[PDB]
């Protein structure tokens, strides 16, 4: 099998974990601990980090046999070749390079925030800025079932969790943009995304390690 | 003609500037200012931002005719797939996907260091783990002319930024990898940019924007 490692923590890697279940592909996951306060031992990660044959050690790895990839979006582009979910013409290529990385944009400013110190002051600030990001994944989406066009690909995986991460933050957030309320739930209803959902390999909580200010222990 | 939008500065850019200049693309540029202190006035960006017509407004962005593109990563590829500067075979591929995400990963921690008002106290840090970063750079290269192995791939354009960027800060840094030197060198022997590093097109410095601690203004 496909061995996937990661922290025990939804992280950046709720979009790998997902696409391993839609896709059937037959897996095996190593959850890494981190130690609790004040020194967040990693030990248990930094004892194989060098001892696996990775070119870049880094988490999350994916190990495929011979393949051994890192980088959470490289993880995901290697599955969407394998199970052809990849743009088909250079619109829909265009569009999912262009979500991909703004997807990434997008966890990485929620990061910033729930990783900060002054948290409290910082949510607010964040919070107003909430309709014109939502404004613009709703007028991207416009009347298409997913992100591409016609076709789920793997980028729908990416903002599926962007837009999951922001209604357990701010659990209004979608309410003043329906298709995106909808993409949600569409994403929620493909069978074996439901059956993952209920199964007791999920892992939706904590989002952050240990150290965030909110939600990572 | 494609229309190219950026601050004033190398910043994130240079990748693009180098792959329109190497594939011949017919380009003009437009350069933001940005206020000088304190308020480093962003209007002229700010007075346009929402009236090109981009998806997600952003800097950079790549206008071509009908196709809008906003994301260094997603114009690398656009123009990638143009040219075909593309991995070929599934090897080639995954390691293109890869080291565009850690290029991305190693920028990103330079411009960590030298935005933070603690820099002169970040910056032996960095040092010091410098020789890690390197050394996973030049065995991933090996004895190949290129990253993805004998072709040029768009890759090659950012991993050159990444290590021309590291050896304007630290001079010293790629004299212990003689294949990463070899390969800027040879980057820097292609006609058409050794051609443009010449011209009056050209912007090396300043990489960061006015606000950094080190080389901004
Ligand atoms: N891709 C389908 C496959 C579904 C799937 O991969 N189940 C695994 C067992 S599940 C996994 C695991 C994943 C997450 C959390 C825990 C576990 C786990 C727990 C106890 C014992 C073994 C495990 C394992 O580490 C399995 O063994 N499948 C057949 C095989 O690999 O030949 C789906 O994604 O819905
Ligand atoms: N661009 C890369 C980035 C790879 C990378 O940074 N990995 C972090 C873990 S990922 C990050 C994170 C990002 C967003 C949301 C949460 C997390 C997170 C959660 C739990 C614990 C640590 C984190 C972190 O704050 C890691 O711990 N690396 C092992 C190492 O450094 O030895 C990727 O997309 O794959
Ligand atoms: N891709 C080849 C093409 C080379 C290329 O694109 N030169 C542009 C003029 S150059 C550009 C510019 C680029 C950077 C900085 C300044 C300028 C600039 C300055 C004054 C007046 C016009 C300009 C313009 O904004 C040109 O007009 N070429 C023919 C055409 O577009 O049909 C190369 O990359 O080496
Ligand atoms: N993931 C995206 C990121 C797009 C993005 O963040 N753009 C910044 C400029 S780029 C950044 C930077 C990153 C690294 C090195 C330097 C810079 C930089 C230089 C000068 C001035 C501002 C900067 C910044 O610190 C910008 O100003 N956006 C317009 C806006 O926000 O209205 C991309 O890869 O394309």
């Not at 030990?43 to 070119?55: C, H, P, R, T, Y």
Request: aromatic share 14%; glycine share 6%; proline share 6%.
């Amino acid at each position: 099998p496909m061995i996937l490692g990661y922290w025990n923590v939804r992280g950046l890697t709720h979009p790998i974990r997902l696409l391993l279940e839609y896709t059937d592909s037959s897996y095996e996951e190593k959850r890494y601990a981190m130690g609790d306060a004040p020194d967040y031992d990693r030990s248990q990660w930094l004892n194989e980090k060098f001892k696996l044959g990775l070119d870049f050690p880094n988490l999350p790895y994916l190990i495929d046999g011979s393949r051994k990839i890192t980088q959470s979006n490289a993880i995901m582009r290697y599955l969407a070749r394998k199970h052809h979910l990849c743009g088909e013409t250079e619109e829909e290529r265009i569009r999912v390079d262009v979500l991909e990385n703004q997807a990434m944009d997008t966890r990485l400013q929620l990061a910033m925030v729930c990783y900060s110190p002054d948290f409290e002051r910082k949510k607010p600030e964040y919070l107003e800025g909430l309709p014109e990001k939502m404004k613009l994944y709703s007028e991207f989406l416009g009347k298409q079932p997913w992100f591409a066009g016609n076709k789920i690909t793997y980028v729908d995986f990416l903002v599926y969790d962007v837009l999951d991460q922001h209604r357990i933050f701010e659990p209004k957030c979608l309410d003043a943009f329906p298709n995106l309320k909808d993409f949600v739930a569409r994403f929620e209803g493909l069978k074996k995304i439901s059956d993952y959902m209920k199964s007791g390999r999920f892992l939706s909580k904590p989002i952050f390690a240990k150290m965030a200010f909110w939600n990572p222990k």
